[PDB]
Enzyme design. Structure first.
Site, short mmCIF file in Angstrom:
data_model
loop_
_atom_site.label_atom_id
_atom_site.label_comp_id
_atom_site.label_asym_id
_atom_site.label_seq_id
_atom_site.Cartn_x
_atom_site.Cartn_y
_atom_site.Cartn_z
N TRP A 29 9.02 7.00 -8.16
CA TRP A 29 9.28 6.87 -6.75
C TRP A 29 9.91 8.16 -6.33
CZ3 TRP A 29 7.10 3.12 -4.26
CH2 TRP A 29 7.45 2.89 -2.91
N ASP A 55 13.03 12.92 1.71
CA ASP A 55 13.34 12.57 3.10
C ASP A 55 13.25 11.06 3.32
OD1 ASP A 55 10.46 12.71 2.77
OD2 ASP A 55 10.29 12.65 4.95
N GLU A 60 10.23 9.29 2.32
CA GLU A 60 10.02 9.29 0.86
C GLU A 60 8.87 10.17 0.36
OE1 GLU A 60 11.35 5.10 -0.29
OE2 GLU A 60 9.58 4.64 0.88
N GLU A 61 8.60 11.28 1.03
CA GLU A 61 7.47 12.12 0.62
C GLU A 61 7.80 13.59 0.38
OE1 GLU A 61 5.62 11.22 4.28
OE2 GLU A 61 4.43 9.55 3.51
N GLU A 70 4.51 -2.56 10.50
CA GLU A 70 4.99 -1.20 10.35
C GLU A 70 4.24 -0.24 11.29
OE1 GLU A 70 3.80 1.52 7.02
OE2 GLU A 70 5.90 1.27 6.47
C1 LIG Z 1 6.68 2.71 0.90
C2 LIG Z 1 6.35 4.18 0.93
O1 LIG Z 1 5.01 4.32 0.38
C3 LIG Z 1 4.48 5.63 0.34
O2 LIG Z 1 5.23 6.44 -0.53
C4 LIG Z 1 4.89 6.59 -1.93
C5 LIG Z 1 3.46 7.17 -2.07
O3 LIG Z 1 2.51 6.16 -1.80
C6 LIG Z 1 3.20 7.72 -3.48
O4 LIG Z 1 1.98 8.45 -3.48
C7 LIG Z 1 4.32 8.65 -3.90
O5 LIG Z 1 4.34 9.73 -3.00
C8 LIG Z 1 4.37 11.06 -3.55
C9 LIG Z 1 3.17 11.84 -3.02
O6 LIG Z 1 1.96 11.25 -3.50
C10 LIG Z 1 3.25 13.30 -3.46
O7 LIG Z 1 2.19 14.04 -2.88
C11 LIG Z 1 4.59 13.88 -2.99
O8 LIG Z 1 4.66 13.80 -1.60
O9 LIG Z 1 5.68 13.12 -3.54
C12 LIG Z 1 5.67 11.74 -3.12
C13 LIG Z 1 6.87 11.07 -3.76
O10 LIG Z 1 6.83 11.22 -5.17
O11 LIG Z 1 5.54 7.93 -3.87
C14 LIG Z 1 5.93 7.53 -2.54
C15 LIG Z 1 7.32 6.93 -2.63
O12 LIG Z 1 8.30 7.94 -2.81
C16 LIG Z 1 4.58 6.32 1.72
O13 LIG Z 1 4.17 7.68 1.61
C17 LIG Z 1 6.03 6.27 2.23
O14 LIG Z 1 6.13 6.93 3.49
C18 LIG Z 1 6.43 4.79 2.34
N1 LIG Z 1 7.80 4.64 2.86
C19 LIG Z 1 7.92 3.72 4.01
C20 LIG Z 1 8.53 2.42 3.53
C21 LIG Z 1 9.80 2.02 3.81
C22 LIG Z 1 10.20 0.58 3.55
O15 LIG Z 1 10.17 -0.14 4.78
C23 LIG Z 1 10.78 2.91 4.56
O16 LIG Z 1 12.07 3.01 3.93
C24 LIG Z 1 10.27 4.36 4.67
O17 LIG Z 1 11.09 5.04 5.59
C25 LIG Z 1 8.79 4.38 5.09
O18 LIG Z 1 8.30 5.69 5.30
#
Ligand SMILES: C[C@H]1O[C@H](O[C@H]2[C@H](O)[C@@H](O)[C@@H](O[C@H]3[C@H](O)[C@@H](O)[C@@H](O)O[C@@H]3CO)O[C@@H]2CO)[C@H](O)[C@@H](O)[C@@H]1N[C@H]1C=C(CO)[C@@H](O)[C@H](O)[C@H]1O
Ligand SMILES: *[C@@H]1O[C@H](CO)[C@@H](O[C@@H]2O[C@H](CO)[C@@H](O[C@@H]3O[C@H](CO[C@H]4O[C@H](CO[C@H]5O[C@H](CO)[C@@H](O)[C@H](O)[C@@H]5O)[C@@H](O)[C@H](O[C@H]5O[C@H](CO)[C@@H](O)[C@H](O)[C@@H]5O)[C@@H]4O)[C@@H](O)[C@H](O[C@H]4O[C@H](CO)[C@@H](O)[C@H](O)[C@@H]4O[C@H]4O[C@H](CO)[C@@H](O)[C@H](O)[C@@H]4O[C@H]4O[C@H](CO)[C@@H](O)[C@H](O)[C@@H]4O)[C@@H]3O)[C@H](O)[C@H]2NC(C)=O)[C@H](O)[C@H]1NC(C)=O
Ligand SMILES: *[C@@H]1O[C@H](CO)[C@@H](O[C@@H]2O[C@H](CO)[C@@H](O[C@@H]3O[C@H](CO)[C@@H](O)[C@H](O[C@H]4O[C@H](CO)[C@@H](O)[C@H](O)[C@@H]4O[C@H]4O[C@H](CO)[C@@H](O)[C@H](O)[C@@H]4O)[C@@H]3O)[C@H](O)[C@H]2NC(C)=O)[C@H](O)[C@H]1NC(C)=O
Ligand SMILES: *[C@H]1O[C@H](CO)[C@@H](O)[C@H](O)[C@@H]1O
Ligand SMILES: *[C@H]1O[C@H](CO)[C@@H](O)[C@H](O)[C@@H]1O
Ligand SMILES: *[C@H]1O[C@H](CO)[C@@H](O)[C@H](O)[C@@H]1O
Ligand SMILES: *[C@H]1O[C@H](CO)[C@@H](O)[C@H](O)[C@@H]1O
Ligand SMILES: *[C@H]1O[C@H](CO)[C@@H](O)[C@H](O)[C@@H]1O
Ligand SMILES: *[C@H]1O[C@H](CO)[C@@H](O)[C@H](O)[C@@H]1O
Ligand SMILES: *[C@H]1O[C@H](CO)[C@@H](O)[C@H](O)[C@@H]1O
Ligand SMILES: *[C@H]1O[C@H](CO)[C@@H](O)[C@H](O)[C@@H]1O
Ligand SMILES: *[C@H]1O[C@H](CO)[C@@H](O)[C@H](O)[C@@H]1O
Ligand SMILES: *[C@H]1O[C@H](CO)[C@@H](O)[C@H](O)[C@@H]1O
Length: 471
Positions: free
Chosen positions: A119, A175, A178-179, A399
């Site tokens: 994560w 951030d 989470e990206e 969402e």
């Molecule tokens: C829930 C969360 O899901 C998503 O984040 C995850 C990605 O799906 C994964 O691929 C991985 O992301 C990596 C990228 O693939 C990589 O290119 C680089 O950017 O590093 C990333 C992190 O290692 O892991 C992610 C989790 O860290 C989606 O992108 C993310 O925006 C989503 N977060 C939402 C969910 C919640 C829960 O309600 C909120 O707290 C957040 O603010 C939302 O943005």
């Protein structure tokens, strides 16, 4: 209008939906422990059946403000949350233990066990947000004579989180979305706030927070670097444009009703925050089919950042609501000050809504003031109408909503979406949160230093809650 009535009914739906998502009696989240705020009941595609420190902190701070305004029935929910965090703080996880970085862990399983898969960790905004949510309740406890609960339960939990903030603020992390692994505006902004109100609370319970004191001015010094001259850079170490609703959230969540339009703390009415508001919102005007045909003086569906591809990149309910909330806060500030100022920095924001805009100071009794606030209120309500238009018939808020057809997508019944609705509605009605002391924490040091201060860590055990009667 129908917006007014929709909001009144939606505020009731939002309150109920939030409670349904909190264990261990929440109707939608059987399995969640006591006081555990679940992000969404969706267990699959996507699986949001976890508890995030950020979402929980934001939701609980909203509940604390409603409680303090008279919603006394929320008391047990708040107590359960605080009790659950005493346990969560000590849970050994991939980010570390209590005193070795564990507090920066983004999410946990609803049963209070660690999430061990990969994560984007750590996320340093969480400890700050959790501290802010708890401090608000601790203040109520102090004010209403439950000193023991404040001093022995709340303060020690808060002390752990503030120590984490002071020790690691100057280190990269992910951030709020989470990206991006780097340094983020929202995070730095909420961390500065937490240390400031944390020091005030420590003094109130007869203790101290030297680390809050030495680090707050340095975090604020660093915060100034995010201003590019035209908008607020969302993250350093990123290849994107940097326009991101992350910055609007940073503003509304650090809004202080006693603050003037301070640029140093990026208050909602600051020229920097207004200029940023237009730059961010405008970045979504041409990328969503849903926004086709709208003019620059009209509200549009707002997403996270224009480069977003999560579920193909769509507008988010909470982001669209944040765009309105910043304006309701600004209206409140202008009204309370009795004037509004237009500068070279914010001219474009105003000119888009009132073509006769010109730099100058406009008193609340002036014709220009009246024209501008009417235009601003209409613009703000516009964002809320877009939300009303795409919410489900029974009020459910997911969402995201589709960039082309506006259908709800991603996690259903997102707890954060509901809290965002409650805060935007409150600000719209001039219901503001307690001050955090911005008026004595907006002074920027002459020289910024890359530094930190280590506080102290100690595990808290919540033996029992005194019989607190809230009337
Ligand atoms: C829930 C969360 O899901 C998503 O984040 C995850 C990605 O799906 C994964 O691929 C991985 O992301 C990596 C990228 O693939 C990589 O290119 C680089 O950017 O590093 C990333 C992190 O290692 O892991 C992610 C989790 O860290 C989606 O992108 C993310 O925006 C989503 N977060 C939402 C969910 C919640 C829960 O309600 C909120 O707290 C957040 O603010 C939302 O943005
Ligand atoms: C407003 O009205 C709406 C509409 O009625 C309300 O929303 C509905 O609320 C109910 C709950 O009251 C939800 O029921 C759950 O459904 C999921 C399955 O969801 C998926 O499938 C649904 C059905 O799809 C099919 O039919 C539709 C037509 O009906 C059709 O269009 C579709 O193509 C397909 O043919 C989808 O509708 C649903 O979509 C929604 O969610 C998507 C993802 O978030 C979103 O993108 C969509 O846009 C849409 O919003 C989705 O695809 C069931 O799995 C779930 O069952 C769990 O919970 C019940 C109790 O609530 C329990 O009996 C089950 O045994 C099961 O329990 C597990 O999960 C619980 C948490 O959810 C947990 O507490 C339990 O302990 C247990 O967990 C354990 O197992 C899991 C295994 O995965 C594991 O992960 C855990 O760790 C643990 O070990 C419910 O039955 C509806 O989905 C929802 N409908 C919609 C459209 O949203 C809304 O609430 C109302 N709002 C207000 C304010 O009143
Ligand atoms: C720990 O604390 C210290 C002390 O506060 C931090 O040090 C400061 O760090 C900032 C950010 O790097 C730095 O500001 C840069 O100054 C350079 C000139 O000296 C500028 O060239 C640079 O420009 C970027 O930011 C501008 C806005 O300020 C943008 O307009 C401009 O486009 C640049 O942004 C792009 O490039 C950056 C690369 O820098 C990239 O990351 C972005 O994504 C974007 O693409 C900055 O203005 C200060 O000079 C430093 N202060 C001191 C005293 O050294 C340190 O960063 C902190 N570290 C952490 C991890 O928190
Ligand atoms: C923010 O706080 C500073 C003091 O830290 C003031 O100088 C400023 O006017 C604003 O109130
Ligand atoms: C305003 O206050 C800050 C400390 O909060 C100083 O660093 C600054 O120099 C100014 O006096
Ligand atoms: C960071 O740097 C400051 C001085 O710049 C120190 O006071 C602190 O102890 C840490 O080393
Ligand atoms: C935070 O980091 C500083 C270095 O910037 C240390 O001096 C301090 O002890 C703490 O670990
Ligand atoms: C920061 O550093 C101090 C001194 O080493 C510790 O007491 C604290 O627990 C944290 O590790
Ligand atoms: C840091 O300081 C706290 C509070 O004084 C102690 O309880 C802890 O053990 C550590 O030394
Ligand atoms: C550190 O402080 C906590 C909170 O008071 C205690 O529970 C622990 O025993 C240690 O003294
Ligand atoms: C403080 O931390 C300890 C572990 O270090 C836990 O056992 C306790 O429940 C609390 O979380
Ligand atoms: C709270 O206090 C208990 C002892 O009563 C500890 O076991 C726990 O680690 C925390 O300090
Ligand atoms: C509640 O009270 C017990 C009394 O033994 C403590 O051990 C515990 O740390 C908590 O404060």
């Amino acid at each position: 209008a129908t917006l007014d009535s929709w909001l009144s009914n939606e505020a009731t739906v939002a309150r109920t939906a939030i409670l349904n998502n909190i264990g261990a009696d929440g109707a939608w989240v059987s399995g969640a422990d006591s006081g555990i705020v679940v992000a969404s009941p969706s267990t699959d595609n996507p699986d949001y059946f976890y508890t995030w420190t950020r979402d929980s902190g934001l939701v609980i701070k909203t509940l604390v403000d409603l409680f303090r305004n008279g919603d006394t029935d929320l008391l047990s929910t708040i107590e359960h949350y605080i009790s659950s965090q005493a346990i969560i703080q000590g849970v050994s996880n991939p980010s570390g233990d209590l005193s070795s970085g564990g507090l920066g862990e983004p999410k946990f399983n609803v049963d209070e066990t660690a999430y061990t898969g990969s994560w984007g960790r750590p996320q340093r905004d969480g400890p700050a947000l959790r501290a802010t949510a708890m401090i608000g309740f601790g203040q109520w406890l102090l004010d209403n004579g439950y000193t023991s609960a404040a001093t022995e339960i709340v303060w020690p939990l808060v002390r752990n989180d503030l120590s984490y903030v002071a020790q690691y603020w100057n280190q990269t992390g992910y951030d709020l979305w989470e990206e991006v692994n780097g340094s983020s505006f929202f995070t730095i902004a909420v961390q500065h706030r937490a240390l400031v109100e944390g020091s005030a609370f420590a003094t109130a319970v007869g203790s101290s927070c030297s680390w809050c004191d030495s680090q707050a001015p340095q975090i604020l010094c660093y915060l100034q670097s995010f201003w590019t001259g035209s908008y607020i850079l969302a993250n350093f170490d990123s290849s994107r444009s940097g326009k991101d609703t992350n910055t609007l959230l940073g503003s509304i969540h650090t809004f202080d009703p006693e603050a003037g339009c301070d640029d140093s703390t990026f208050q909602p009415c600051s020229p920097r925050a207004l200029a940023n508001h237009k730059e961010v919102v405008d970045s979504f005007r041409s990328i969503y089919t849903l926004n086709d045909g709208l003019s620059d003086s009209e509200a549009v569906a707002v997403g996270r950042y224009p480069e977003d591809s999560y579920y193909n990149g769509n507008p988010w309910f909470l982001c669209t609501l944040a765009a309105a909330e910043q304006l309701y806060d600004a209206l409140y500030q202008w009204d309370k000050q009795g004037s509004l100022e237009i500068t070279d920095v914010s001219l474009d924001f105003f000119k888009a809504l009132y073509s006769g805009a010109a730099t100058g100071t406009y008193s609340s009794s002036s014709s220009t003031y009246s024209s501008i606030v009417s235009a601003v209120k209409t613009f703000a309500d516009g964002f809320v109408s877009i939300v009303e238009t795409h919410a489900a018939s029974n009020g459910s808020l997911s969402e995201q909503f589709d960039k082309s057809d506006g259908d709800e997508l991603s996690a259903r019944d997102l707890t954060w979406s509901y809290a965002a609705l409650l805060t935007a509605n409150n600000r719209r009605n001039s219901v503001v949160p307690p001050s955090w002391g911005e008026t004595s924490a907006s002074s920027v040091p002459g020289t910024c230093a890359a530094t930190s201060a280590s506080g102290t860590y100690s595990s808290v055990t919540v033996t029992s809650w005194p019989s607190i009667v809230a009337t």
